[PDB]
Paper text:
Lipins are magnesium-dependent phosphatidic acid phosphatases (PAPs) that catalyze the dephosphorylation of the membrane lipid phosphatidic acid (PA) to produce diacylglycerol (DAG). Our principal findings are that the M-Lip domain is a new protein fold that forms a dimer, binds membranes, and can affect lipin PAP activity, oligomerization, subcellular localization, and adipogenesis. Phospholipid synthesis and fat storage as triglycerides are regulated by lipin phosphatidic acid phosphatases (PAPs), whose enzymatic PAP function requires association with cellular membranes.
We, therefore, truncated the M-Lip domain of mouse lipin 1 to remove the C-terminal cluster of hydrophobic and basic residues implicated in membrane binding by HDX-MS. We refer to this construct as the M-Lipxtal domain. The M-Lipxtal domain could be purified without detergent and was extremely stable with a melting temperature of 65 °C. The structure of the M-Lipxtal domain of mouse lipin 1 was determined to resolutions of 1.5 Å and 1.9 Å in two unique space groups. Phases were obtained using single-wavelength anomalous diffraction from selenomethionine (SeMet)-derivatized protein. The structure of the M-Lipxtal domain revealed a protein fold with a three-stranded anti-parallel β-sheet at the core. Flanking the β-sheet were a set of two alpha helices (α1 and α2) and a short 3–10 helix (η1) that were oriented perpendicular to the β-sheet and two C-terminal α-helices (α3 and α4) that were oriented parallel to the β-sheet. Thus, the M-Lip domain represents a previously unrecognized and novel protein fold. Two additional peptides present in the crystallized M-Lipxtal domain were also protected. These peptides mapped to the same surface, which suggests that the core of the M-Lipxtal domain can also interact with membranes but is not the major determinant of membrane binding.
Author numbering:
A (entry chain A), B (entry chain A): 461 to 548
Amino acid sequence: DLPSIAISLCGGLSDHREITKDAFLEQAVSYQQFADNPAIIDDPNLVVKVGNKYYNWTTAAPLLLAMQAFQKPLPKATVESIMRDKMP
Amino acid sequence: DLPSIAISLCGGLSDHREITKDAFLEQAVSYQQFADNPAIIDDPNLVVKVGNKYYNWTTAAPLLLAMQAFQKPLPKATVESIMRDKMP
């Protein structure tokens, strides 16, 4: 019931570029890849796809914590506020 | 099937103290509390309980990202490695 999550190293947020599905998919991070290098989570090019939206880690973090701690997403208005504070 | 997650502002990790269940529960963070102040995620006293273990946010982050991106936890040996790198 929760929105799906996927991660990629395609980058493109800090420079404010329009991210393509195929670019995201081409650099998707696998479980084995992440387990072998958990520091991927600190890579500035990490993009987190939540449902149909692309976020950086700093914005995705509170969204993902709320989903797993409370089994429901944050309110849309809260997400928009977090984006204003933590998205590039 | 995934381990349960809960969050609290009880603190006690950076000073290396032995955290009590009741202290964690007394300062548990609610959904409304987190939605009203998502910056709680940056509070140094934030403790993340994953299953039966207490982590700080920097350690919990890759564990929670892997659970939601891959629908399974990281290997125990990987978690132990992350703890050595990111736990206080």
